[PDB]
Design a binder for this molecule. Structure first.
Ligand code: ZN
Ligand code: ZN
Ligand code: ZN
Ligand code: ZN
Ligand code: ZN
Ligand code: ZN
Lengths: 325, 325
């Protein structure tokens, strides 16, 4: 029984079939790491704002919505296509490697009310979550999400909760050891944050396996057979009643496309994507080394190919956010 | 047009005339400072919980509600009189003297939803605010209060905002220099936090003058005449449309009583009090030095006299929270 305004706002984030075919560019710390590979200087605010503007200007005509951060992304939000909706990120970027727990913390100048006043159709918040963590840590995380979920009810604005999994006992997310526990980490977190007390509207989540270790896709060690990986997608689908969409996690455009196909064939009725680096990552080096004009040209050719190829796959694979179990 | 449930909850916090005749004991850091004057050991959790229990057991029959903190005050909340309502504090105790700005920060395990689930009839949050501070500091404070105000709308629970004033240029609140600016600091903060965007239900505030420097009350220097002090109370009344109640700030029971009379004669239509140390402060030394039985005896004699004398003054001076301008 979702409120009329929350329904209306999620319609504004979705395409004409109800698929969330969204473009993600709220990267801050992560964008700076990408830029640091191609220049010796620290990135400027102006530089970062302008790169986000280029992506919004060139690619939002092909997206149903764009996710931006309010620290650098407000000029880009003004530049978005007239039919493209807006999500704004609410968490501070990254986490303190020297503090235990990756504890969640909102941007200090912002509230759900102020994000709505900037024109957001949704508030997005990223939480790092390990279901096996100490309860002393996880209680703080549950309480924090309850606050944000309550703010978004009062402000009558959809709450998109992004969950990224981790385990302090397995510090490398990309490892074989992490790949074995990932389905559990992802699916259990979804079960928890689907509880009504968190007031989440849409979950933005990882695919439950690391595809780099799935039979057929794997160039090295194989952690799961195709049958095993497919079952992890089925378990993910059963973990929530809420609409859920996938993040790209910086894999190649082609691997992300083949992942969505695999999810669909396995029986995950995912409702779209918030796809960032798989679409636009190549623009960063071009912008730095060649300049603005060359970056625009990259976005009009390769960027366009990446998002158009993605949209074609979504048409065949994704399910309206309104579909009910 | 307050919601039905918020109205019902504030009725539960008020007496049969609609006056908030409430008992405050959410002190944590401040209570420890009081206890440290009478023992060499650091206070224990068990010790602090039990002192709050004694106050709830002996005095809540004479109060319309009690304000407690969720860190030590939950056993005391269970012990309150059946007709006495409950407010729970949401902020961490005190502030970091080594960090600039006294920036607001909720208790990490709590949310408005969880406070409501403990049986609170209201959420109370303390904000330290200097209207003359840098905007870089104050924007964070406004954003933070907007979040809490929004949570309390969603959870349909009254939001009591306590404001304490300060000025980093005048580090001693109790000084003559601070006394001169206090009315401005207090009244301007009330004007700001009465804006609809903060969703405050009731303001808990300081009296706008330091009575220790008002003509007639002053033993030393006189900062304001009686006429001048009376006008500051009139300005306070005009600063808000919301119900507002006074905190005691640890003055004597008799001075607090004469302050409420002065406010009333000046034309401040205050709606009650959240009175803490003026009522129970003497119990702390007795509990530590003499023990539990002696503390109960103090509460049944002097404690009772203090709260009963206060209730008599409130009957003559305070206005229903429902009164409209
Ligand atoms: Zn390079
Ligand atoms: Zn993301
Ligand atoms: Zn198909
Ligand atoms: Zn003593
Ligand atoms: Zn107080
Ligand atoms: Zn009178």
């Amino acid at each position: 029984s979702k409120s009329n305004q929350k329904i209306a706002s999620i319609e504004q984030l979705s395409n004409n079939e109800g698929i969330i075919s969204a473009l993600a560019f709220d990267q801050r710390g992560a964008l700076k790491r990408m830029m640091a590979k191609h220049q010796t200087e620290e990135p400027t605010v102006a530089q970062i704002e302008q790169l986000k503007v280029l992506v919004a200007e060139e690619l939002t005509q092909y997206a149903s919505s764009i996710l931006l951060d309010p620290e650098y992304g407000l000029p880009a939000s003004d530049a978005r296509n007239k039919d493209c909706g807006l999500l704004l990120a609410y968490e501070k970027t990254g986490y303190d490697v020297n503090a235990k727990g990756r504890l969640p913390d909102c941007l200090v100048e912002w509230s759900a009310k102020r994000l709505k006043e900037q024109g957001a159709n949704a508030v997005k918040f990223l939480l790092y979550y390990d279901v096996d963590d100490a309860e002393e840590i996880n209680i703080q995380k549950k309480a924090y999400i309850e606050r944000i979920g309550s703010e978004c009810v009062a402000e009558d604005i959809p709450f998109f909760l992004e969950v990224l999994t981790y385990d302090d006992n397995i510090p490398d997310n990309g490892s074989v050891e992490f790949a074995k526990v990932k389905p559990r980490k992802v699916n259990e977190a979804m079960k928890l944050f689907s509880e009504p007390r968190f007031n989440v509207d849409v979950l933005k989540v990882e695919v439950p396996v690391n595809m780099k270790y799935v039979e057929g896709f794997a160039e090295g060690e194989v952690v799961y057979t195709k049958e095993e990986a497919a079952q992890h997608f089925k378990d993910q689908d059963a973990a929530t009643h809420l609409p859920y969409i996938y993040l790209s996690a910086g894999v190649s455009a082609e691997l992300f496309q083949e992942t969505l196909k695999f999810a669909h064939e396995a029986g995950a009725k995912f409702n779209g994507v918030l796809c960032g680096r798989a679409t636009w990552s190549g623009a960063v080096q071009v912008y730095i080394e060649q300049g603005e004009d060359a970056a625009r040209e990259w976005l009009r050719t390769t960027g366009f190919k990446n998002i158009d190829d993605l949209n074609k796959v979504l048409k065949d694979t994704a399910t309206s956010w309104k579909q009910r179990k």
